[PDB]
């Protein structure tokens, strides 16, 4: 049941106070794309010299088992906070859906070391022990520990998303999601899968909604009830505006239809 019955325009509020505070202004990539308070990731154990050390522009997405953190690409001044998030939440898989720079605009500040290098990002130590190139993505095997605890964090960095619109077919996204799914399931009690793009809502929302629907089909089979608008509204209750364009909406149905056809 991956048929489109409703048009995107039918898809059409909760507090965002923390994101709005003056102390947090420079932690947002876009002035008006902010995390809801009720699902934001709250960062603990911050530097006690910092009056505000609990904020990152990120939300937990729980499909309503696997959960996600939807976030923006790092800014130079949020790279440390991003690694505090990944550590604290026990995340073991990161899905990066952008290049660092697209059409000459930054979309994410490099927050991982080169292959066979290590860097410390604030209190977090990150070692890149191996990269693997695939046609549609690079996988980086990262080892994360707290400088004062090591665990492997696998970063799947999608390569092939066009700088304009969406991929004209979903094969690359589905191969990538399938590897993500198996890696997450390979790691006992891994935490939420981190997904990001520039703002953390368009590409990030498209990937998370496709993964959620594909996971339903895993549990329930190809004839299960699917409701894409309801699933989008459900994720939108947890971070504002997820799935931004009509092309991304049509791409979601195309991807789930192709997934069904592999079964």
Q: How many CA atoms lie within 13 A of 233 on its CB side?
A: 9
Domains: count for the chain = 1
* Pair 95, 88: CB distance under 8 Å: no
CA atoms within 13 A on the CB side of 105: 10
225 is in an annotated binding site: no
Helix, strand, coil proportions of the chain in percent (round to 5)? 30, 25, 45
Q: Which domain holds residue 108?
A: 1-263
Q: Which of 74, 108, 197, 224 is catalytic?
A: 197
In CATH, what number is assigned to the domain containing residue 152?
3.90.190.10
244 is in an annotated binding site: yes
Rg of the chain over Cα atoms, rounded to whole angstroms, equals: 18
Burial annotation 181-208 (CB, 10 A radius, 16+ → b, else e):
bebbeeeeebbbbbbbbbbbbbbbbbbb
The CA-to-CA distance between both ends of the chain, in Å, stands at 13
Residue 197 among the catalytic residues: yes
CA distances from 195 to 73, 138, 142, 158 (A): 9, 15, 16, 11
Residue 46 annotated as part of some ligand binding site: no
Query: Looking at the DSSP assignment, which residues form a beta bridge with residue 59?
Result: 40, 70
């Amino acid at each position: 049941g991956a048929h489109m019955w409703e048009e995107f325009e039918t898809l059409q509020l909760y507090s965002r106070k923390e994101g709005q505070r003056q102390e947090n202004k420079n932690k947002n990539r876009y002035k008006n794309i902010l995390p809801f308070d009720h699902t934001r990731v709250v960062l603990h154990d911050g530097d006690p010299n910092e009056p505000v050390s609990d904020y990152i522009n990120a939300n937990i997405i729980m499909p309503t088992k696997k959960s996600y953190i939807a976030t923006q690409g790092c800014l130079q001044n949020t790279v440390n906070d991003f690694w505090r998030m990944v550590f604290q939440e026990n995340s073991r898989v990161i899905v990066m859906t952008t290049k660092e720079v697209e059409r000459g605009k930054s979309k994410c500040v490099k927050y991982w070391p080169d292959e066979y290098a290590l860097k410390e990002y604030g209190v977090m130590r990150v070692r890149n022990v191996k990269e693997s190139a695939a046609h549609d993505y690079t996988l980086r095997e990262l080892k994360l520990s707290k400088v004062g605890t090591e665990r492997t964090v696998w970063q799947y960095h999608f390569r092939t998303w066009p700088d304009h619109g969406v991929p004209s077919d979903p094969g690359g996204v589905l191969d990538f999601l399938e590897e993500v799914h198996h890696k997450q399931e390979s790691i006992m009690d891994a935490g939420p899968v981190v997904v990001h793009c520039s703002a953390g809502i368009g590409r990030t929302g498209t990937f998370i909604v496709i993964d959620i629907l594909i996971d339903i089909i895993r549990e329930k089979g190809v004839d299960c009830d699917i409701d894409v608008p309801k699933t989008i509204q459900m994720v939108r209750s947890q971070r504002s505006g997820m799935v931004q364009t009509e092309a991304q909406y049509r791409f979601i149905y195309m991807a789930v239809q192709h997934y069904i056809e592999t079964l």
